[PDB]
Design a protein around this ligand. Structure first.
Ligand code: FE2
Ligand code: FE2
Ligand code: FE2
Ligand code: FE2
Ligand code: FE2
Ligand code: FE2
Ligand code: FE2
Ligand code: FE2
Ligand code: FE2
Ligand code: FE2
Ligand code: FE2
Ligand code: FE2
Lengths: 271, 271, 271, 271, 271, 271
């Protein structure tokens, strides 16, 4: 298993920029060509929510074209900036197992040594996340029938407060429901999230829980300052690789930088 | 607790650049001024190893001046690029609790809600890591005598293979002995490492185990390619914060990037 | 009083760039978010003319949206690239006291310790400036009733030749009319202008007279070369602050640069 | 008359960078080659002070070599970072009219339509400015014996507070004594200063009074915040030109930027 | 004779980017303003094929506007990405001597000391080039009546394999036909081509044969790797100048870089 | 045969930058690591002259270390910036076939399908080139005794004027003597040169004759302007490859640029 994992693409309509100046459509198209160009090709690409910025039809048309140009199977979940019905209408052909019901979008993937669980934490009419009882019970059934086989969950909102003054009040509001599931099921070992536009990681029992950077703009972590900042600090994604018994996640830079060069011992320490 | 955690500074001697062209001394002096300029000030800075590039006295002179200009308590550990005796001679004044024996540099910090354990995984005459008999024993003594207070270890070499073709053969050779400590001691929940010049994370039992980016040059993760690559992809560090019961780690960019601006709902979705 | 003062925005229609390659709409939207993000928030924003590039309705629609997204009261005046009638139609809702008559756009602001006088130097069918007799007589009435209270004038065209070979032939053609007013009224102490895309300052009696940089492209000052150059040298604006009895103007960079860091005496002069 | 006016070069010793990371010696050598490359050649270059960073002989050796490679007559004055005796020893050969007494470095230039007056506002053992009894007196003698020929003063410290929270407490402490000279002497119409690393301008009676940007690092203007910030925002200098009766100052960018291109009416507004 | 020679502009429709992220329309408009701004003004501009990217009408509308804004006579030829009929419909007014027949576009220019021969190597329904027999016989007539006067050919596809693994299989397929002409006619001394997005030169008898860089994106030369790479390495064009008996070609950078400065012997070798 | 061909490295002494600001030593060390990192490895690297800037021993010490870290056989020749005796003392160990006589440094390489001839066109006490009586004779001996095997010459100075106003007066003064050799010897088909810091090419009989860009700073081509300009436009080198019967030269960028990505037909022309 090799997965490329991006999020918070924030697509705008054709010929619009985010906030009028951040060319998200071009930046994401660059990211898509970067992923198509990888030497070690992933089995699939995950996009963990906030696919579009305003939940508008014309933004989904752009998303559908640019994400549709990935030469990979996709697993897509919504974020709070998404519109559940339009998300399903435009993006379900790219990710068929989302289903038919915009209020119950989720699926399990059983192709790999670790099972993948994709869920919808977005709630209409708010930025905060919410796990519906049907999501929690579907998750219980998945984890129970899964038995010993390890599981990872992908969702948009982090299920616990991470100390980020801007992002915490809009985390998953009833994230305790997922925490309770990691306590029940030792099989559940990874939860990956978007929303925060930041690589921030923590551990609850046997679960590693991490948020991801955005593909374009980032949000700095502040503990005591509430100003809604964003910046254009370097974009990245997470590659997830099954390495024997270990699920390993590594950061893959989406920036354009100098290098690589080859290490040479004589050049390292001249005599 | 707030810790700034940097790694793999690779200082060179006063007039010199790494490989002749990468100005590590200037890049690290910038990092140091960035850390002194933070609005949310850390309690301490951790430098997890490969402090100098060649193990030479003149590189340690530069490291002592530049790391000495941090306005923070420091916790310093060696990497394989370091020389134990010189590391002690030059850097112990910046981290007195290392001790007096260059063969047994270790310390436990008990000031915070989580116990911090700093060890030397470097071995003279090789790039691979090794945990001495004394280290393994001292580590076990800290955990055994430490009750239910959680512990995090800082060491230079990853204690397990991560699938990185360049970096795996030179991980901690008897790292499985530390993995046996995570199995027996549920209070051991974090292991942070340098060596890899890459953010790569995994979970083993309750332990989250992560390598860090370097402050200057990075090494990309390849699964099959053993070509010794490095590049100048964006540098960053890890901030570690205690957030109630949670140890949270977030990536702090050390690059210079546009921003920040403030989010405005009307600019986000114009009508 | 704190004023942020920008000019020569040169807005184009949606999806056009200036000259086909300078993204003025994105650059100005960046500037607008920068101004919204200021820690020391101005009382108002002044835009001293050449709001649009071609005087076209679709350019005013873009200007109205982007300038309308400033979280500040605005004072707007036209430049030669503007169309007086369309300027009034689209931008008067953003600056109500311009009035109702496109040929007599001007206003006085009496909110601060120094009174602010906004005038229209643009003339239909030419690049040169012109002060109509109704503007001059309105100015005489304003300065006479103002008495001892200091006054600053904002206009698009500089009222005297500044030695700039490109810009001088298209300065205010009858600028002597304003010069004559500074001679009559010792109360008149600042005249700020756009047009030149350059920070160029001079003094006539008690008046400081300055042109401003553009928000996007600049024009270099040449004394003896007549080629109509423009470049993308660094953009800035002027902040105007009342400091006791002093009106002070300082340059605020609109570029994205490294820093800030904090000054430290030990780092400044190592021993 | 054409003068290029730079300020606050802050040279370091031969192998050294400012704060360990800002290459002032290289940045200043670039500035020097830019000045030698101008098509419109100045009659003289003014360096208004803080020539070196630490007042050390080896910094003056670098300053003498780099400033000595200007193909222009120089007018040099000290700042608080300078050492008077060493400034005289090393730099008087580049500006012979400074004199022979390191405690009374002053000169009047009478070659142009405006008299130029160069003074030392620096005081040993402090960052604030001070006008010695002898300086104030000599300044008054120049103005009193100078009739109706206009005068401009170059000095390092601003003679009045500008509202800059970082820089105001370290302005010229008895600067009001120079303000008394502008009140009594209408021929005194320009005062130009370093110290602030910022273009900030004000008018007092007939005098335009301005601080300059540095050639390398800048200090932002804050009204309330006293945190000692500096940044690497775009560097520039001031060109001073005599244009008939007008002394005109314009900002000349020292950055490397795209351009110039030529304005074309058809490219500006396509049909 | 001075010719500016660009190629492979790859224009897209209004508001589209190449591959969704490379702003070719803006980049080419920059190039056009750079060419308009040249101090040594060319007699004509040559564009050697792949004017548009997809052969679509809306792309030709953009090409026609941007190339139409060059203040020079143009010589335009098609490449494989072009559509012969639409090329003629939109671009023939910019280059009248292309003619009236989209299948037989070619012309001779006899204005200079060397005659210029523009031909169409593009073939409908393929990327490979093809020289029709009517092109070869027209060329024979041109070279025969030309006699002793030297000749240069401009065509899109290189007439021989250059060892480029990506580009060779799509060179001119029957390029031997042109090679046979250089063997017959010692008068034929230059053949310039687009297609390769790379400055690559060779010699066959008395003919210098060269491909050109693109105005925007480039393609790296690989000998043994077949992956269809492109990059944004620096763009340039070729200036062709008649220097007495010599046709000389020099590379003119279209990038924005630091400089120029003037060489000074004292600054070069300090003493 | 694959040759990497660089030129005009202009090394400075250990702590020094070219003109005080261009870090040639670092830029060349980067070039060297780029060359060692190529996937398609050259058989040899050619350095066509102006190896050091000032002809000083300490510059040769740097050149020997940096050029000595190339993992390739080297062919080195002098330029006018070089000192013959010191060039031999320091660099002959890197290119033993230069010989033992600093006045007659020449060698023929016969390893490949094309004979390579390396000569010294530099003359002590001038910037112009000169072919010694012995060189011309030895060159003729190589060609006369060499039969129908093709030959390429590497020399520092162009053997003919190229129309470059700065560089033409300092070309090879008796270069016409080498032109006489191309006339008599059809096997002589390539002459490659440094000196110009510009890719400029021409053909004389069967010989393709080209100058190279420098590895660091470039000199623009001007026809009328003699002002001694240099700039930091993109650096590159020439790769020379034997492709069957064809000697092919391609430009290899030494800049750091975005890319590469992979061409995709669907991303190229979306529907
Ligand atoms: Fe988001
Ligand atoms: Fe979100
Ligand atoms: Fe390391
Ligand atoms: Fe290491
Ligand atoms: Fe304007
Ligand atoms: Fe204007
Ligand atoms: Fe200063
Ligand atoms: Fe100062
Ligand atoms: Fe092409
Ligand atoms: Fe092509
Ligand atoms: Fe050279
Ligand atoms: Fe040379």
């Amino acid at each position: 298993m090799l997965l490329a994992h991006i999020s918070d693409t924030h697509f705008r309509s054709r010929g619009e920029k985010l906030y009028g100046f951040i060319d998200v459509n071009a930046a994401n198209a660059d990211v898509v060509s970067q992923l198509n160009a990888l030497r070690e090709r992933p089995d699939a690409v995950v996009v963990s929510g906030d696919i579009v910025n305003c939940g508008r039809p014309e933004e989904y048309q752009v998303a559908r074209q640019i994400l549709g140009s990935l030469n990979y199977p996709l697993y897509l979940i919504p974020g709070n900036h998404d519109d559940k019905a339009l998300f399903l209408e435009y993006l379900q052909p790219l990710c068929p197992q989302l289903g038919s019901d915009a209020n119950n979008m989720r699926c399990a993937v059983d192709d790999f040594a670790t099972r993948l669980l994709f869920i919808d934490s977005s709630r209409a009419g708010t930025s905060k996340g919410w796990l519906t009882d049907e999501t929690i019970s579907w998750l219980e059934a998945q984890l129970f029938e899964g038995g010993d086989k390890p599981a990872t969950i992908f969702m948009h909102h982090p299920p616990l407060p991470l100390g980020n003054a801007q992002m915490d009040p809009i985390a998953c509001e009833n994230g305790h429901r997922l925490l309770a599931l990691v306590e029940r099921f030792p099989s559940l070992t990874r939860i990956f999230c978007g929303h925060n536009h930041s690589l921030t990681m923590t551990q609850y029992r046997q679960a590693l829980i991490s948020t991801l950077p955005g593909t374009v703009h980032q949000v700095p972590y502040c503990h005591a300052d509430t100003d809604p900042y964003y910046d254009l600090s370097p974009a990245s994604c997470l590659m997830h690789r099954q390495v024997g018994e270990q699920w390993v996640s590594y950061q893959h830079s989406l920036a354009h930088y100098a290098g690589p060069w080859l290490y040479d011992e004589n050049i390292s320490c001249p005599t």
